[model samples]
Target: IQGNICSEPKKVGRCRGSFPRFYFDSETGKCTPFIYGGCGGNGNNFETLHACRAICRA
Candidate 1:
């Protein structure tokens, strides 16, 4: 699945987070792994592709 991050429900399993971290790549126009700063700034975060597509529009 090279070059295919197209709302595939990809997740970063290593990160222990209350809110899932997923930021939209302006360059690639896809959602990719993003780690929260433990405070704020995860407005783009999504728990799943169902959420990712809604927020990131990937």
Candidate 2:
């Protein structure tokens, strides 16, 4: 909702932990699931699919 902030690329972080997360895919215009490392991730990461869709989807 704020100048294509949702268009950022997915970041899983540098750690080795396996945390479930969601990211908005600008190319496909959908929220997709991915593994998170629980550290150093960026704004593209979301706690849930719905959260990602709500913020990223127009």
Candidate 3:
């Protein structure tokens, strides 16, 4: 379920690993691309845009 995840802010942490990822931008109500640092992130992080949309899109 979307529950609180859709409402939570997207986080890209300060770690050094570079990986392409997507997260739900609660303000825009859409999944947006970002560079994930591979650690210290939150549940809003997703491996793909489609995965983010599938779970979090309203």
Candidate 4:
């Protein structure tokens, strides 16, 4: 498994956004925002209206 990317942020309790979807970027050495299938993003991660609202806080 890859090393923790948001370790500092998580430890400091500064990482916002619940249910954050992350992608492992080998070159960047962190989990980048490769996709956000939330409300206004791509794919169908947010299929139901309630699910979208519940996931994204928007």
Kindly report which residue stretches of model 1 are placed more than 4 angstroms away from their true locations once superposed: 1-20
Top TM-score model: 3
lDDT, each prediction? 0.51, 0.77, 0.78, 0.34
Ranking by lDDT: 3, 2, 1, 4
**For model 1, how does the per-residue alpha-carbon lDDT over 1-58 read when each residue is reduced to its tens digit?**
3224333433344444445466556567766656554454424455554566665562
Between prediction 3 and prediction 4, which has the larger TM-score?
3
Candidate 2 lDDT, tens digit per residue, 9-58?
78767787778888888788888898888875666788889878777764
What are the clashing pairs of model 3? none
lDDT of 3 by residue, 1-58 (tens): 6756666676667888788888888677888998888885767787889988888863
RMSD of 4: 13.5
Candidate 2 versus the native: TM-score? 0.75
How many clashes does the backbone of model 1 have? 0
Looking at candidate 4, what is the lDDT of residue 6?
Answer: 20
Candidate 2: give the clashing pairs: none
* Candidate 2 Cα lDDT to native: 0.77
lDDT of 1: 0.51
Q: Which candidate tops lDDT? A: 3
